[PDB]
Amino acid sequence: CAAELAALEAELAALEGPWKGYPIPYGKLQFLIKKLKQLKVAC
Amino acid sequence: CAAELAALEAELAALEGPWKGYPIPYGKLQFLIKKLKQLKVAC
Amino acid sequence: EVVKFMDVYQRSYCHPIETLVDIFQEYPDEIEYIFKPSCVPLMRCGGCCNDEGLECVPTEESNITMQIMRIKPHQGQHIGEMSFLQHNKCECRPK
Amino acid sequence: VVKFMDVYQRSYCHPIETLVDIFQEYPDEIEYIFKPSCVPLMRCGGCCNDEGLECVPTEESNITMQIMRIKPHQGQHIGEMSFLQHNKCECRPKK
């Protein structure tokens, strides 16, 4: 939970990379949804 | 922690709407960034 | 702050991107109506193949249905379903 | 089906990721071949739903990218290039 939470935090914070103001590809949203679901099942 | 995570999974799942394969604005993820900070020392 | 070469190359390369497409480009034989909105957001192949002999073409397609307002002289606005072609996968192919 | 108000709002004049050929931005650098040949930029797009209006920027910024540049004689160089971004857009009268 804690480390998976910290991981998702750091991924969301960094999510733009250098692409400031750019939309987040659907694939990345699905990856986040999967990570958040795996984080719910963890915890 | 698992209850908060359920809420956020639902909210994240809510962003796509009918827009399958479409990117999302990074602004639409702010709710999640704020909420995962609120789960660190909390959850 | 500088976008590294590797990142520019990955994000520019031929792939489906949200594209604002004029409905008349999809329904060129519509004579009766004008549309609101006039354009729709569609996923369509775009970006570059970095070879003037290559082009970015769809290899997988699907449809999306949207409610569009259809406006005609001397009558009320209608709202009706219209279907549009989506690109799901793209490849750089010889012209 | 995408509901009318969802289509209308997503189509309306706003910054969209737009794949722009570098020669459009650097028309005076056509002695070079750029790789990639296009870059993804945020640029006003979508529709104003009024032939009298055009979608124009009201807030702008710059982004710097590493781009490979080739004189057909010498070797590949990788150099920074700056591009104008659009951060906010409005439908404004053409005239």
From Swiss-Prot, chain D:
Stated induction or repression of this protein's expression: By hypoxia. Regulated by growth factors, cytokines, gonadotropins, nitric oxide, hypoglycemia and oncogenic mutations.
Cystine residue pairs: 13-55, 44-89, 48-91
Tissue: Higher expression in pituitary tumors than the pituitary gland.
Residues bearing attached sugar chains per UniProt: 62
Noted disease: Microvascular complications of diabetes 1: Pathological conditions that develop in numerous tissues and organs as a consequence of diabetes mellitus. They include diabetic retinopathy, diabetic nephropathy leading to end-stage renal disease, and diabetic neuropathy. Diabetic retinopathy remains the major cause of new-onset blindness among diabetic adults. It is characterized by vascular permeability and increased tissue ischemia and angiogenesis.
Family indicated by similarity: Belongs to the PDGF/VEGF growth factor family.
Name of the protein: Vascular endothelial growth factor A, long form
Species annotation: Homo sapiens (Human)
Residue numbers of the full-length protein present here: 220 to 314 of 395
